[PDB]
Design an enzyme around this catalytic site. Structure first.
Site, mmCIF file in Angstrom:
data_model
loop_
_atom_site.group_PDB
_atom_site.id
_atom_site.type_symbol
_atom_site.label_atom_id
_atom_site.label_comp_id
_atom_site.label_asym_id
_atom_site.label_seq_id
_atom_site.Cartn_x
_atom_site.Cartn_y
_atom_site.Cartn_z
ATOM 1 N N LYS A 65 -21.743 26.569 -11.201
ATOM 2 C CA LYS A 65 -22.352 25.566 -10.324
ATOM 3 C C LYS A 65 -21.893 25.762 -8.881
ATOM 4 O O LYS A 65 -21.451 24.829 -8.193
ATOM 5 C CB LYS A 65 -22.040 24.155 -10.829
ATOM 6 C CG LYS A 65 -22.452 23.970 -12.276
ATOM 7 C CD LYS A 65 -22.596 22.525 -12.629
ATOM 8 C CE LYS A 65 -23.419 22.361 -13.892
ATOM 9 N NZ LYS A 65 -22.700 22.942 -15.033
ATOM 10 N N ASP A 68 -20.533 25.989 -2.484
ATOM 11 C CA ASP A 68 -19.751 26.146 -1.272
ATOM 12 C C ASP A 68 -20.625 26.648 -0.118
ATOM 13 O O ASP A 68 -21.848 26.719 -0.246
ATOM 14 C CB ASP A 68 -18.582 27.105 -1.534
ATOM 15 C CG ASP A 68 -17.303 26.668 -0.847
ATOM 16 O OD1 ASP A 68 -17.310 26.568 0.393
ATOM 17 O OD2 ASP A 68 -16.292 26.402 -1.553
ATOM 18 N N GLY A 180 -30.464 14.323 -25.577
ATOM 19 C CA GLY A 180 -31.685 15.102 -25.538
ATOM 20 C C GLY A 180 -32.075 15.656 -26.888
ATOM 21 O O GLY A 180 -31.214 16.002 -27.706
#
Ligand SMILES: O=c1cnn([C@@H]2O[C@H](COP(=O)(O)O)[C@@H](O)[C@H]2O)c(=O)[nH]1
Ligand SMILES: O=c1cnn([C@@H]2O[C@H](COP(=O)(O)O)[C@@H](O)[C@H]2O)c(=O)[nH]1
Lengths: 219, 219
Positions: A65, A68, A180
């Site tokens: 993820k 920066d 889900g």
């Protein structure tokens, strides 16, 4: 695009090397793609990626993820791909320059970037959800081919599929533990990501086999 | 709040252990607070934190910009504090539950969270900037005491300071290489974060001493 066996990607977020290797071994017959994140890597080191490749030959998605500035994103991707990852996940929220930085390194090293568009947890409604369609369009503009969207909101997952087109590759976490449904999610996603429902199961193998049984008509 | 020597935090983003250690050692008389990010950690392992503590009298901020769902955030923080980090950075844009997950681990383990508000790079304008004031306010409501804001946009840094109040601790990257000015930034931030201006200098110690000399009246 990436060909994921049984449309099922194991999220291996156990934080002990022995457990991670044992559990992945137990479900190896059902998968060929493992998502490895910071819980495992920060607990056992980046060498764990090479070890998974040595043991299973599975494809590895580094779910880092990346979020920066461009210069740092470049360094993170280089380190990640040096470690043997086939793909890396990248947040879109920090903007197009930050994403492009990751795309550059991926192209250089023969790897894939997965753009995170909307996350599946409740907090995603605060800021991410409202930006998610624009983030997806940004991905399209940037030539991004791989995307991540939320199993927990199939209407949002569907919208994201609409934006990126049927040719793009879409994977989806939030299946099981987060609420889900596997089959509903595969209406829109190419592959589902499943962590706890498998790796916390008394019997991970039966857990994986069960899920696959439930989607057998979708292959 | 943490007592940052000379209001200067080294961003140690070199990716080689020998260089990172050499350069940090050379500037240790000027600093006592080091920010270590994924570039170094993914290259050299989490034990680099232990090595820095062994070699230097420095507090360590793990700049991991945690940006996952609450359950994964918890794991990342636990692994990071287990390694000996004093503090960890956390993105606010994934929402309050994701932040609270990090705060809860930090509270439990006696460590600190830095909440990232607005980033200093150009792409920050696309999505983060518009959410940043609300992210800061969210931080205040959650009880966050430590924040990160952008050197490159003094007007935004000033506003973020207002939101979080004078008692909150605020550190600011984007000084030097990205264009931010040490002095102007310290009008609002408690400490400045400096990477390349120091670690790429022919003489990192002279670079650090020079920055300090330029802000001596603010020390
Ligand atoms: O929006 C999301 C939600 N979860 N995850 C990741 O996918 C996995 C979901 O695991 P689970 O099946 O145990 O919920 C975890 O590794 C989590 O960090 C994402 O990447 N994005
Ligand atoms: O908004 C920002 C901008 N930069 N950084 C980080 O601060 C350091 C800035 O380094 P530099 O002085 O070499 O630009 C790098 O580690 C970068 O990842 C942030 O955390 N937030």
């Amino acid at each position: 695009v990436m060909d994921v066996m049984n449309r099922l990607i194991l999220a291996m977020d156990l934080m002990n090397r022995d457990d991670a290797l044992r559990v992945t071994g137990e479900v190896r017959e059902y998968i060929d793609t493992v998502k490895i994140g910071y819980p495992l890597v920060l607990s056992e080191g980046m060498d764990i990626i090479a070890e998974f490749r040595k043991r299973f030959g599975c494809r590895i998605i580094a779910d880092f993820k990346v979020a920066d500035i461009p210069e740092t994103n470049e360094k993170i991707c280089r380190a990640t791909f040096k470690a043997g990852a086939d793909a890396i996940s990248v947040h879109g929220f920090p903007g197009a320059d930050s994403v492009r930085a990751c795309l550059n390194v991926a192209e250089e090293m023969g790897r894939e970037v997965f753009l995170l568009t909307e996350m599946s947890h409740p907090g995603a409604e605060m800021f991410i959800q409202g930006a998610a369609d624009e983030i997806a369009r940004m991905g399209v503009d940037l030539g991004v081919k791989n995307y991540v969207g939320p199993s927990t909101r199939p209407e949002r997952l569907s919208r994201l599929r609409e934006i990126i087109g049927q040719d793009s590759f879409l994977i989806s976490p939030g299946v099981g533990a987060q609420g889900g449904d596997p089959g509903e999610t595969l209406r829109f996603a190419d592959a589902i990501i499943v962590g706890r429902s498998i790796y916390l199961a008394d019997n991970p193998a039966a857990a994986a086999a069960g899920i696959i049984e439930s989607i057998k008509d979708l292959l």
